Amino acid sequence: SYHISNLLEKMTSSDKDFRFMATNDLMTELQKDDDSERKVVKMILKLLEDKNGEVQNLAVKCLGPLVSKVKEYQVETIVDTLCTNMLSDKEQLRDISSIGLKTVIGELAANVCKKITGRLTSAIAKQEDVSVQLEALDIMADMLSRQGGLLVNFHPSILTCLLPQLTSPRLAVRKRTIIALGHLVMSCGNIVFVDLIEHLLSELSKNDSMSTTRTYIQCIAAISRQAGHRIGEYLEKIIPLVVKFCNVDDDELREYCIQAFESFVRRCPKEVYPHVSTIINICLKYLTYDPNYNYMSWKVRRAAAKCLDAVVSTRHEMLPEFYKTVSPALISRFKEREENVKADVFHAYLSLLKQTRTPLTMLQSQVPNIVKALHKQMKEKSVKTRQCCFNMLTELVNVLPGALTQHIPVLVPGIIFSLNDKSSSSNLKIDALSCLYVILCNHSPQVFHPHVQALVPPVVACVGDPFYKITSEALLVTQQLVKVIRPLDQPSSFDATPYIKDLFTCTIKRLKAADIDQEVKERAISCMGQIICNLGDNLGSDLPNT
Amino acid sequence: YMKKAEARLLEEQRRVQVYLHESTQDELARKCEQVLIEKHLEIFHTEFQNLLDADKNEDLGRMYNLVSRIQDGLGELKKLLETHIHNQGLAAIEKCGEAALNDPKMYVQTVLDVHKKYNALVMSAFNNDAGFVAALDKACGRFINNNAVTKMAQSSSKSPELLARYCDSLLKKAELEDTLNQVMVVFKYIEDKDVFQKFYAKMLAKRLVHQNSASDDAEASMISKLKQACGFEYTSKLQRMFQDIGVSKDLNEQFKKHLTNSEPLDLDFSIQVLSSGSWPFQQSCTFALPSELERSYQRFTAFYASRHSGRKLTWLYQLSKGELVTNCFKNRYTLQASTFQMAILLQYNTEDAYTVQQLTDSTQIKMDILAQVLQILLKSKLLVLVELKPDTLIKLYLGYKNKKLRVNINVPMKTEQKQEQETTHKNIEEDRKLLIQAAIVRIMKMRKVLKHQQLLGEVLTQLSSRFKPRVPVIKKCIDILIEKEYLERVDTYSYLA
Amino acid sequence: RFEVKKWNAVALWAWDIVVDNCAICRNHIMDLCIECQANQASATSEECTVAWGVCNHAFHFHCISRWLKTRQVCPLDNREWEFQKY
Numbered sequence A: 001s002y003h004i005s006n007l008l009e010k011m012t013s014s015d016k017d018f019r020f021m022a023t024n025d026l027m028t029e030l031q032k033d034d035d036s037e038r039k040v041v042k043m044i045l046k047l048l049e050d051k052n053g054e055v056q057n058l059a060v061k062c063l064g065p066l067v068s069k070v071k072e073y074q075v076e077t078i079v080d081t082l083c084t085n086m087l088s089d090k091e092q093l094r095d096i097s098s099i100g101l102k103t104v105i106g107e108l109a110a111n112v113c114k115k116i117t118g119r120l121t122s123a124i125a126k127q128e129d130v131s132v133q134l135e136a137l138d139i140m141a142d143m144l145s146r147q148g149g150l151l152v153n154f155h156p157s158i159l160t161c162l163l164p165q166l167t168s169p170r171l172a173v174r175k176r177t178i179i180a181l182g183h184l185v186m187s188c189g190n191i192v193f194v195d196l197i198e199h200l201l202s203e204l205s206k207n208d209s210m211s212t213t214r215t216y217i218q219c220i221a222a223i224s225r226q227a228g229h230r231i232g233e234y235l236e237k238i239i240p241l242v243v244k245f246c247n248v249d250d251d252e253l254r255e256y257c258i259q260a261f262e263s264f265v266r267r268c269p270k271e272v273y274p275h276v277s278t279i280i281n282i283c284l285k286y287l288t289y290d291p292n293y294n295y296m297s298w299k300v301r302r303a304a305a306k307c308l309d310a311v312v313s314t315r316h317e318m319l320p321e322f323y324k325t326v327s328p329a330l331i332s333r334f335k336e337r338e339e340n341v342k343a344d345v346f347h348a349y350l351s352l353l354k355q356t357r358t359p360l361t362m363l364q365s366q367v368p369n370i371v372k373a374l375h376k377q378m379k380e381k382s383v384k385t386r387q388c389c390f391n392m393l394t395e396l397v398n399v400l401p402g403a404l405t406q407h408i409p410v411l412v413p414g415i416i417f418s419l420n421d422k423s424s425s426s427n428l429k430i431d432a433l434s435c436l437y438v439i440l441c442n443h444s445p446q447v448f449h450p451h452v453q454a455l456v457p458p459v460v461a462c463v464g465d466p467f468y469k470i471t472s473e474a475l476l477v478t479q480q481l482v483k484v485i486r487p488l489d490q491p492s493s494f495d496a497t498p499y500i501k502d503l504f505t506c507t508i509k510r511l512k513a514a515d516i517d518q519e520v521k522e523r524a525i526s527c528m529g530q531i532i533c534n535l536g537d538n539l540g541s542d543l544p545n546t
Numbered sequence B: 001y002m003k004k005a006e007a008r009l010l011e012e013q014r015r016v017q018v019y020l021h022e023s024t025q026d027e028l029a030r031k032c033e034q035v036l037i038e039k040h041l042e043i044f045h046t047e048f049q050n051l052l053d054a055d056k057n058e059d060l061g062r063m064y065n066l067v068s069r070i071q072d073g074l075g076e077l078k079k080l081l082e083t084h085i086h087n088q089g090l091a092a093i094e095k096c097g098e099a100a101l102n103d104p105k106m107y108v109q110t111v112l113d114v115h116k117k118y119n120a121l122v123m124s125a126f127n128n129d130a131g132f133v134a135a136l137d138k139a140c141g142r143f144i145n146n147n148a149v150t151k152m153a154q155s156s157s158k159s160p161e162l163l164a165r166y167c168d169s170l171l172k173k174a175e176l177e178d179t180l181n182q183v184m185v186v187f188k189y190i191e192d193k194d195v196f197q198k199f200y201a202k203m204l205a206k207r208l209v210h211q212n213s214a215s216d217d218a219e220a221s222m223i224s225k226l227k228q229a230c231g232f233e234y235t236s237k238l239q240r241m242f243q244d245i246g247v248s249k250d251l252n253e254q255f256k257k258h259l260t261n262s263e264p265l266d267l268d269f270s271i272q273v274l275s276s277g278s279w280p281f282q283q284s285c286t287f288a289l290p291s292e293l294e295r296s297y298q299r300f301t302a303f304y305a306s307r308h309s310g311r312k313l314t315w316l317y318q319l320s321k322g323e324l325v326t327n328c329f330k331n332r333y334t335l336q337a338s339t340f341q342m343a344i345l346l347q348y349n350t351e352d353a354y355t356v357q358q359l360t361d362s363t364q365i366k367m368d369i370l371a372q373v374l375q376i377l378l379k380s381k382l383l384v385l386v387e388l389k390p391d392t393l394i395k396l397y398l399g400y401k402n403k404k405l406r407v408n409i410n411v412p413m414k415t416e417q418k419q420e421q422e423t424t425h426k427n428i429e430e431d432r433k434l435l436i437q438a439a440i441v442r443i444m445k446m447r448k449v450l451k452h453q454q455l456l457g458e459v460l461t462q463l464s465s466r467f468k469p470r471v472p473v474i475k476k477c478i479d480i481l482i483e484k485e486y487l488e489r490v491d492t493y494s495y496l497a
Numbered sequence C: 001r002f003e004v005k006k007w008n009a010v011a012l013w014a015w016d017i018v019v020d021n022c023a024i025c026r027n028h029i030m031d032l033c034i035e036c037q038a039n040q041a042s043a044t045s046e047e048c049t050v051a052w053g054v055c056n057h058a059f060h061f062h063c064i065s066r067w068l069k070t071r072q073v074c075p076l077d078n079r080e081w082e083f084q085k086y
Ligand SMILES: [Zn+2]
Pocket: C022, C023, C024, C025, C026, C027, C033, C034, C059, C060, C063
């Protein structure tokens, strides 16, 4: 009773240190009388306008826990004064009140929300000032994100003020309106959703301006992402408009249409079945769109490739159709100038390969084209392209074991070139070694016999690399190489004498180190054991020491 | 085996519901769960590690569902997941090498990839449990602050600097909102946020002064996000610079209107008048203004003296730029250059060669600055004679050829970035010391007599939101406060007013 | 021959009331304090730096720190003092 009075007396001491410490002590006490409530509330409200920034920050932080302890009546006046200060001319008042109101909303019931909704709806409709509009829109989005189910009676009121703002000259207002509309749709009634959907279709049926069609398509994509199943009934009407707008010459408009197609494919799978062929055809048509260059237009290509990836990664019953039409387009598009779209199409075909695991026969038939297209890209100076090529080979061999029986002579030199390259990074070397290991583990030993003379030196060099991850990968590859050069369960005519000494010499140094990491120790032990098991008869006097 | 166990549990439930009594349900469920799960916990842990090593999300979810039926059975899984995430992040950062030291994009993208992958795993497989999200947060906080990159720099403050540089790179000249949100997600785990704030303020000031920003909306969104995450004082500090920019624009427009009435000037003139206490820039080196710029200098000085009598203007010549259209070459060339390049280029018009001492006297530029700018000009193929000696003769190369009509010869120097970074880190150190001193003084003002441990605890709980102080620096601050006669010792200190 | 088309310049403004010297002590703002100069070099002499305020007034850190122990008003204006630079 006396400590509170002392704190309130000291919070007006004309010295910043005393005010700061008193506010900190007050916040500590609240985190741990009816008349005292009014004085505390008024003092916090007045310190919101204090000269010192630290005191203002402390007051804003203290407004949070205050609402829980204080009775229901004073929360109303706190909200009222914050909303009133939100419309003041001063910038500091405006933003400090915005932060305080956000803090109040975060720590929170239906009574205050009604007044907040009324004030925000009144403020947003005014277009004279845009800062107030933006702050009110963001606070409404925050209020709708959580405990938004208590505003059932106010949804039409929010709706009729949100929709007029999609034609505002400022783009930030449009984006915040889209966010707020998505949050509203996430939890709302049935009639409001129908009203919004028919409104969007109504002003999409008429093309009033180019700048507004873009934001309408973006909004439809937003509801498609947020609601999902609730928009599947209107796809029969939505799709033809997007198809019509795809053909428009504007480059920016096309990308949003393709993104909307991708969102429809991803979110509502059951109702998108009749339009899958149309979406696939549009994406295939616009995957190779490049008017200036003949063998800013890469955004549409990225969108088309991403939509193809979304289509392939979800549907599993269309695999024959995919291998009939989608795969040749991507394989022909492997040679694209832009690196980002190249990564996108590589990811799309990797998703197709993952979905594959009859389709296997079609994949085997397509393998030669894949190898021919990948061999050209293996010579590029960019690390990312080579990394994607190695990942694709690894995935292809994993899905199909004996895929590359007839293409080892053309595939080995690329791996060799990537391994002994100064510009190559650690990731590229590791991925190349992993690809070589996967290739060796899933092929007949007789294929690699002519290429051992070119495979052994780079691997031996990789064993001595200072970085230990590459050493571990090289030892793992060396084990399989030893198993390959001298098989024990099959008869072979290959001579393994020249390559024994190099492998033993490179492995023994890692075997007796006593300072290297644990993984390299385990790999060295395993590799030396395999060496002794397979080719230990040709070793000299080093076997007892080993 | 996990699928078999689930099927057997469902079958037992059906059995006891159909043709047994209801009093047997709980006992049968307990016995079946114990026999089928609790006796194979070590095997389950080993398989959990194996499935973490080779990504199989469905199996992880099934294991989580199975082990959830045993009291205190999820702790080992949480510990294993935390260790795995920590090791994966460290390995991912280590593979970058020495390139990540000066490439913020690679560093931040690696961190973001690891965090996104394991956040998706936690939400999908583990049903977004509190323990698993806590383990993910702990692992992220461990591997973000200390890693291979921080060991090369011998400090844990490299990560906030790299994050700030990545933000600057993004904001210089639709998907930007997502990456900004991801960056702000990363910012939550940073222990030293003051370094991030200082560096971001520096880069924002540089962006505003030179007018190279992608858009104003992106800047506003970043300010809003920083308001959500950081405090209110930092945002006020940034809004001060924004207001100064607006005031400078208005003053420039007013001066443009004033110039119409009088005689027009011979060149296009724009000025950025800024407050000296709200911006991080420092006083420029000694410099003599070339004679052809004196008209605009005097005109604007007189205009500002008339408009504001009580203020004086200090000119920064290391942040000014302009155009030098030349007609003494093979064809017409226009080039973008700073004031220093103008001084060491416009000085000779009818002559062809100079010695550095004569050029130094003419331009009044210091030694190192002149050497660096001359090196930059020499590698631009606009000057011909590698080391610059005091007796060297430098002459213009006639007939310089370029493949583009517009040429930019304004390239940052090599040592400038390192010097700026070192200065910023030092300044962060003195600000930390001063903040500690101020906190101690305020605490001792509030409490007349206090102990040592209570003082330390209060200082750390007051400064925690920005940086974590150390005991030696707090002790040194206390000792230097005693020397200044602020508090006196009676291990217990008392405030001496 | 070289010709100039445009010139973009950056300038800083500060109060001209003080002739490049501290108000409390009549010494140059880049020099040391009176107490610092009188006393021997020590840890305190290391942290002698100019301090700015919201009102864009610059004094020595030691000078304003000593002044603020008894008062809470800037020497050159009747407004409260708030640090904003070091
Ligand atoms: Zn002084």
